[PDB]
């Protein structure tokens, strides 16, 4: 059964609700972004209209084999009419093709569904600025003050300098970057760019990246591993065993691995500055965990919500425990009282 925070009242619409079969009364299914917890249940047998961004559409077609006739891509920042209801898709500053959805209900209510997002002050000069929002469906992934992490820019700076330094000292070192979905591409692209290399990867990953409308992508990635000194591997293989094994495969082209595991937050963020991050090392293998987030920090989420001043907030993450729910409602009330809405 579809939970309440996936239904848009006063419409035939659901958001990210493909794992409950045919939802009763649903005339259109919205998909905010191509991450598995959100698309769970789509496949080539799906026969209802799916509304999403162009990039999400490319992935639905090519990776999941959803038939073209059911894929409805919409442009961003544009007022569109879907089954008699005005909607707008906004950039969510999450992974490629991730959107927030604005719904203008026939009765005058305005709903913002953030999908997954990393709130940013630039959102304060989208089409959001123009009108009032009554309900916010909020990505509350890191809705607690302990969740701090740096900007994406500072993390990338750290990784670029780390990689460049290592390979300049040892021209026979290999850089590996872990991945398990789309998003966080800037980590491996930025490192490859500073080293003058393409990024080597499996055919399945290369296929995925070709769906993302990244400019000049054919100049950045390749399936020829041996020509490349930045390799992508599944996140699961980013460990001493997996990387030892991978080093065997390159045929003594390389005598050192420097690997990056982008995580979201880890508790090493309560104590350590990004500048101060050190790897775990075993022999000629080093693994850095770097806190590259595509979700809002606590501070970024609070600022967005205080700016938006919604009338009601419905969290879409961490909703399964009474303790989490209660914690989140407390922070919403503080935020409201502090800003005076
Ligand atoms: Ni996501």
From Swiss-Prot:
Induction of its expression: During mitosis. The mRNA encoding this protein contains an internal ribosome entry site (IRES) in its 5'-UTR. This 5'-UTR generally suppresses translation while specifically promoting expression during mitosis, when cap-dependent translation may be impaired.
Name used for this protein in its record: DNA cross-link repair 1A protein
Effect of mutating residue 139 to N: Impaired nuclear focus formation, reduced interaction with PIAS and increased sensitivity to cisplatin
Tissue: Expressed in brain, heart, kidney, liver, pancreas, placenta and skeletal muscle.
Subunit structure: Binds constitutively to TP53BP1. Binds CDC27, which is itself a component of the anaphase promoting complex (APC). Binds PIAS1.
Parent sequence residues shown: 700 to 1040 of 1040
Subcellular location: Nucleus
Family: Belongs to the DNA repair metallo-beta-lactamase (DRMBL) family.
């Amino acid at each position: 059964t579809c939970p309440f925070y996936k239904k848009i009242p006063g419409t035939g619409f659901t958001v990210d609700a493909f794992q409950y079969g045919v939802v009763e009364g649903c005339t259109a299914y919205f998909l905010t972004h191509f991450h598995s917890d959100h698309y769970a249940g789509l496949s080539k047998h799906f026969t209802f209209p799916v509304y999403c961004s162009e990039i999400t559409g490319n992935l639905l077609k090519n990776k999941l084999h959803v038939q073209e006739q059911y894929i409805h891509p919409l442009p961003l920042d544009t007022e569109c009419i879907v089954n008699g209801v005005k909607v707008v898709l906004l950039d969510a500053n999450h992974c490629p093709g991730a959107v927030m959805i604005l719904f203008y209900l026939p009765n005058g209510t305005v709903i913002l569904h953030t999908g997954d997002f990393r709130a940013d002050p630039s959102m304060e000069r989208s089409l959001l600025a123009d009108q009032k929002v009554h309900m916010l469906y909020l990505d509350t992934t890191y809705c607690s003050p302990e969740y701090t992490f740096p900007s994406q820019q500072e993390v990338i700076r750290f990784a670029i300098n780390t990689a460049f330094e290592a390979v300049t000292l040892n021209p026979h070192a290999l850089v590996v970057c872990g991945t398990y979905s789309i998003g966080k591409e800037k980590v491996f692209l930025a490192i490859a760019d500073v080293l003058g290399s393409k990024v080597g990867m499996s055919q399945e990953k290369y296929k995925t990246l070709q769906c993302l409308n990244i400019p000049e992508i054919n100049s950045l990635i390749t399936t020829d591993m041996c020509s490349s000194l930045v390799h992508l591997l599944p996140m699961m293989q980013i460990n001493f065993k997996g990387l030892q094994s991978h080093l065997k495969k390159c045929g003594g082209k390389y005598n050192q691995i420097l690997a990056f595991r982008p995580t979201g937050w880890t508790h090493s963020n309560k104590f350590t500055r990004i500048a101060d991050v050190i790897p775990q090392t075993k022999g000629n293998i080093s693994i850095y965990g770097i806190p590259y987030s595509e979700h809002s920090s606590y501070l970024e989420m609070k600022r967005f919500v205080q700016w938006l001043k919604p009338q009601k907030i419905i969290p879409t993450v961490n909703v399964g425990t009474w303790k989490s729910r209660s914690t989140m409602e407390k922070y919403f009330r503080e935020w409201k009282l502090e800003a005076g809405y």
